[PDB]
Structures are given as C-alpha cells and as structure tokens.
Curated annotation (Swiss-Prot):
The encoding gene: EXOSC10
Included range, full protein: 180 to 587 of 885
Protein name, entry field: Exosome complex component 10
Role noted for this protein: Catalytic component of the RNA exosome complex which has 3'->5' exoribonuclease activity and participates in a multitude of cellular RNA processing and degradation events. In the nucleus, the RNA exosome complex is involved in proper maturation of stable RNA species such as rRNA, snRNA and snoRNA, in the elimination of RNA processing by-products and non-coding 'pervasive' transcripts, such as antisense RNA species and promoter-upstream transcripts (PROMPTs), and of mRNAs with processing defects, thereby limiting or excluding their export to the cytoplasm.
Induction, as annotated: Down-regulated by mild hypothermia (at protein level).
Glycyl lysine isopeptide (Lys-Gly) (interchain with G-Cter in SUMO1) crosslink site(s): K373
Organism: Homo sapiens
Lineage of source species: Eukaryota, Metazoa, Chordata, Craniata, Vertebrata
Taxonomy, superkingdom: Eukaryota
Amino acid sequence: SIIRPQLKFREKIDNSNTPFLPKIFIKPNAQKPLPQALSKERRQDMFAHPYQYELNHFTPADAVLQKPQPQLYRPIEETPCHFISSLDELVELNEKLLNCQEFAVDLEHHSYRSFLGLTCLMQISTRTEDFIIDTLELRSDMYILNESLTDPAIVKVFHGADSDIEWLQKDFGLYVVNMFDTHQAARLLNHSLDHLLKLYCNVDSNKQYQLADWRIRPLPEEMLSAARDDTHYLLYIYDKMRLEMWERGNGQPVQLQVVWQRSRDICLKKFIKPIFTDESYLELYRKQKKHLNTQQLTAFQLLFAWRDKTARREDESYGYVLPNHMMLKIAEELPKEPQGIIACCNPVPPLVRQQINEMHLLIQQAREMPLLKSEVA
Ligand SMILES: [Y+3]
Ligand SMILES: [Y+3]
C-alpha cells in the first residue's frame, strides 16, 4: 500500500469541527483588499470568499464574445508534456500562463485514504503545451498559481468545475476568476466530455471515467496520458462551443454571457467542512425494519463516535476506518468477545484490527445498558 503522502506535508491537515478558514495569504488581481487577519504575518470577514467582490464584478471581454475562429487541438504526438514538481518549475509555468489568452484546467483527486479528500494532481494546457503538476509535492507552493487563475484577463476553460473549485481552496487556497465551464455550455446546447470529446474531436478517451489512486508515484505513462487528455482538447472545444453557440444567437453574445455568468457562479462556491450525525443513519434504519433496542442503538452511537474520532485523527475516510454496513452489523450482533467484532467484517479493516481492544470496550459498555420493558427477550 502506497505510503500515505500526508506524512511529508510541512503543514498538518486540520480535521476538526473548527470552521474552515481560507488559506490564501496574498491576493493577486485583488480589486478589493484581503483581510489582514489572512496575512502571512498575522498568523472584514476572514471567513468570507476572498474573491467575492471581483467575481461579482467581472465581465467577459468583448474579444471572447465575438465570433471565434476555432484553433484545432495540437496533435498529441507533437504536443510536449511537462512534469512540474519543484517551485522553480511552478513559478516558470505561471509566467508562461500570465502571457496566455486562455488555458485548460482539471484536477485529480483522492478520497479513500483521506478524511476531507486530497488533490493529488493538477493539469493545465496552453494552445501548444500540456502540463502536469504534482500537487502533493508542490502542495504548500501551489498558491502561486493564483496570479494567473485570478486574472480576469485570461480565460480558464473547465469541464464540470463544481468540485474542483472547492478543492482548489481547501487544499491550496486557490481561486478562479474568469472561467468558462464546458459542462455549462453543454447544458444550453444540450453525457458531456465523453460526448464533447467524441462529438467535437472524434476521440474516445478510455480511462476518462476511471477511478484510480492518484497518490501513486511515479505516475505511469497510462495515468499521465489519461490526465493530460482531460485538458488537451478543452481549448478547441472551448472555441467550437462558442461557435455553435454564437451561430444560435444570430451573432449576439446571448448564450455566451450566460455560460460565463453561470460558470463564475461556480467560482463563488465555498468549501465547508462536513459534519456527520448518527441521527441520519438511525432515522434511515427506522424507515427500514429497525429492531434496534437500547443496547444495539447505544453500540451504534459509540461506534459512530469512535469511527469519526479515528477517521479525523488518522486522516482517513469513514469507509476506510469502518463502513456503514459493517458498523451497523456490529451494532446489531453485539459480539461479546473482541474476536466476535473482527469476525463480523468482510474484510477486516486495519484500524479495526488495531483498535479491537478499544472497540471491544465500547460494545461491552453497550451490553451493560438496561433493556426496556418491551425489549426484554
Ligand atoms: Y481525470
Ligand atoms: Y446522536
């Protein structure tokens, strides 16, 4: 199993109910100032979206709203691929981007071995080159990209950026200003990229809807290729969509300004630390044939508490620590022995194995609870 890459992080992850605080500490392309509370030195509403104002006051240049002349995507065979894992690399790319008219953007995520989820890779494409960034290696440095991502002068093409926007700020403190979401454009014109790649370029990117562990290093050529495929064709599609969209408004920036309006709203989405109550599940088991008595129901609350505790600490997801069906099983079975717990999970999760004693005690506690009148055996 891959060594968890969170261990090499200079700054630990805050897995606490504590409210998420934006990470950005310097605001490039800042129409409105950024609170001094967010200053790198002092470490207004710090808990507010940092680029709230600029996104609310942004409009697509007339240059992009005019009948576009699509520029066919460069042949993958003749398109250079650059791997970026060091600060110099990152800083040099930014400069390059700052001189761009528009560029593609997509990310690679991972959530199984993480509590909040983790961005493992970022992809960007210019009209001529494909870039791949190691956002695990360059984690604390990524913020630099804000200079080019928050520049209303340059257009950032995305495909379904809803989640991306959220990740960019949770992990690096990166925000996007001036973004054209191709999934928003597909909604008007009337699934998406699978089609967008086959309808506009006549290409069938196989590993596109494939789930893979992006924490893996080195990244094999296959994933490197599947990663670049997510941004190599977006600028072309970006052009070809404003075309077949301008060819509908009779030559008026009607449906174009809408895609930009909607997309910039996705940029306003903010990240919020998730919260979980065992109430949700208990209410679900009730709709079902809930025969959970005082004891069993207690065990569930104790296991739910223990899993949430463990997950947040160990920085793992609930599924990894102990999945629903498995927790629920133990809650019902109420195994008297520690092995009775283990022999109730298929397969036995590592943390359960390691905290077997701890879990045993919880279940025992539940077994000492007083059974109601109607609950008597
Ligand atoms: Y992907
Ligand atoms: Y409760």
